[PDB]
Symmetry: C3
Subunit: 328 residues, 3 copies
């Protein structure tokens, strides 16, 4: 039966951007083919040069956002090059069975595996590595991402009416626990293996040293600031595979928000801030109405402005004095 379904290949895109797709499906179910290569690599996470041994899906933190439609089949070819040193796998929160696929995609360096699962539930979901006995270590090393399963007829508001976005961004929020020496400075490591002991110790404090968007402090600012224009409808998919977060668009709102990201549920309206539980992906739809710079943040202002969970939006267009204006 699966053999009768036509197949389509997707070229993934590095976050915060998302690979193109049709919001409203133009055909019946399909088998969507994806391919990701696991890559263990050093990564600089803050402005002081602190670097870690990151574990990534396709070389980025977070991994790329995968997009399909409800009832399509997701077929992922997962590759683990012999240049890596650890065993990895992948767990799809969108999938049903075998620990989300974790127990079927274990691959040591030099191996690859292909997993297929039916996307039976619409919504944005988290996907992350989960090696038996070393789950949080891999996840907090940046090995997580998300997949969006759109309703075949696109998104809908709290009244069944269509909600169409002009652009979509994927913000992966990452909590890091960089080990510190007795002096209070970040220790150095040659391999992911040597850091395990200290990694476990750092994680058990439950106090992140960093909390960043797209892999590093200020990653989504400057030339990498998100963009929009007055009148533009923007969907922002936000995930946190291990810890709670509370997204907030400073100067705006989440007009329609699926805090826990499942589309069969009507969205919450006019959110100033929403809670995305650790191990969940959420989605917020907003129509810009004012130009200028906006800050998108985890509203625990310490986590945002001190630990790194903050990015920017640069919006073009005409200022609306009716909505807001400085009185002189």
């Amino acid at each position: 039966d699966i053999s009768t379904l036509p197949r389509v290949k997707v070229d993934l895109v590095k976050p915060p951007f998302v690979h193109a797709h049709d919001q409203v499906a133009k055909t019946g179910p399909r088998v969507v083919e994806f391919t990701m290569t696991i890559e263990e690599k050093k990564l600089v996470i803050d402005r002081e040069g602190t670097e870690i041994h990151a574990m990534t899906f396709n070389g980025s933190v977070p991994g790329p956002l995968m997009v399909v439609h409800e009832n399509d089949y997701v077929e992922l070819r997962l590759i683990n090059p012999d240049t890596n040193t650890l065993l990895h796998n992948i767990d799809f929160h969108a999938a049903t069975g075998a620990l989300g696929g974790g127990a079927l995609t274990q691959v040591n360096p030099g191996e690859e595996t292909t997993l297929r699962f039916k996307a039976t539930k619409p919504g944005v979901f988290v996907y992350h590595c989960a090696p038996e006995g070393m789950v949080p270590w891999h996840v907090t090393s940046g090995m997580n991402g998300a997949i969006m399963v759109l309703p075949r007829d696109g998104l809908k508001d709290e009244k069944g009416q269509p909600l169409t976005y002009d652009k979509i961004y994927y913000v992966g929020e990452q909590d890091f626990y960089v080990p510190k020496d007795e002096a209070g400075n970040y220790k150095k490591y040659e391999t992911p293996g040597e850091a395990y002991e200290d990694a476990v110790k750092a994680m058990r404090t439950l106090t992140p040293t960093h909390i960043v968007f797209n892999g590093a402090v200020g990653a989504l600012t400057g030339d990498h600031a998100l963009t929009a224009a007055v009148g533009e409808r923007v969907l922002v998919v936000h995930s946190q595979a291990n810890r709670d977060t509370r997204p907030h668009l400073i100067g705006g709102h989440g007009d329609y928000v699926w805090a826990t990201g499942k589309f069969r549920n009507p969205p919450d309206l006019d959110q100033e801030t929403w809670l995305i539980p650790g191990g969940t992906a959420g989605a917020a739809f907003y129509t810009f109405r004012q130009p200028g710079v906006y800050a998108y943040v985890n509203h625990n202002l310490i986590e945002a402005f001190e630990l790194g969970a903050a990015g920017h939006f640069k919006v073009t267009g005409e200022w609306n004095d009716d909505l807001m204006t400085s009185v002189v």
Copy 2:
């Protein structure tokens, strides 16, 4: 106000069972309102909470952590005979989040060793609720010592989905999540005590760090694994009641979902569908309904993976049945 004659209502006694199991009950009420009689005996006792053998001075309702799940229907009356045997050393009481008045019953149930009391309250609101000890000035100490449980007030007509249609579970489990703050010494080793009291100062200090040393299901690391793993079969509808009386948690069925979830657990509200993960606020009980479609081992966890796989907030499901290659399969 004209009194309501309660003496006319039929009475039924309930024999509580230890978690994660639940005492006998009917989803769809087979009778009209009843005065449901429960009896719990407070028991202060030593308890091993991890594989290394760490032992604490636990404060329990009926000898278990969490306390047993009580089940009644909307508008029944809950009558609890609370006993504090003279073998205990501390003052205790009980606060039902399901009750209205006297601090949930806390102001009417203070009992010292050797005393007992009987409380009755009308379960006017359907949902799963937390119940916990709450002695003035020592509330968090008793609660984080394991003295909390949960009560489920089923709608008289059973559970319903977002469309008002019946949702019937084949089995139910109660997972009580506990955050422990075991004090350690200057060296970093868990300190030991002969009496619950003597450790108060240290307990307060350990708690105020807001950093749990252990976060476990059913009283201890691995309590719901191995021979004590939860079970189900493909096609089975399972309801998992999960409570956390003091700290937030984010349940997740690894390999499954929360088909219908009442994150904050109140049934007059439609459930959230297809949840991958949900947030149950500290001081709240939530419920998740799921229909298994794949056999095999599943992990039920607090999705802060550190709290789950390092601190202990993880349990297992062993499911029987035929594998579905359509839902998921490895490609050759």
Copy 3:
């Protein structure tokens, strides 16, 4: 156009109390004029006499609750007396544009500014100071409050029927991070700026030393306890500008709760406890049915009974034997 609207000047009142207002709008859109004076001052936050250099809106923590109706224009005159030492501004989560107003309300000591914005979305929202580069420091120093934007036809239940409260209280929850020394004792400073470094270090631990209602431990207890009577309908607006909280009325419930505080959404019913994410304001409606003392708390019992997040309600009326009683 805006010039054709009636203008009304409001006299703000100290929390937990709220200035007089009508729930169902008595007129059409108006320009509601408010005035707040920024005040840097010392504040004792606990029973041990611990004092901090608080940054307040109108001299209190939290700042006062502002009340308007959906589509009214909020016009705020923010005054920064030359007796203060820092620059301040204000960000309204209810406003659209310029970082909620922060980018247009920067005022040094000796300056003032007037901001106007249209309250286009109904619900309770957080407002707080947000100076670039010093956001969490000002917010956790107590510089935050809330504004309620009532639907023009008042509050409604899950079935669209009217919900009218007899009284309303505003509980502002504040997380403080008082720096300590070697000995572990709270340090004191001559000026707020002098302690910037210690404050940053204290905040970065993500562990509050105090979590209080209305500025201090026990602020809403004793003769300052909240009051009600059996049969009374009470709305409790609760905000937390920087950290999550989980309100709970001990002995009662949240009959109708807008956890994330936006009225276009139906309220959640019969809540025992609800989660208000940091950077959000929530509202709970309850009809008291039993007299006596009630405790209103953040239900992380440690934060409530050890750190200070607990208040009291003293309720009058006759006891209801049917709802509860102590048996023979």
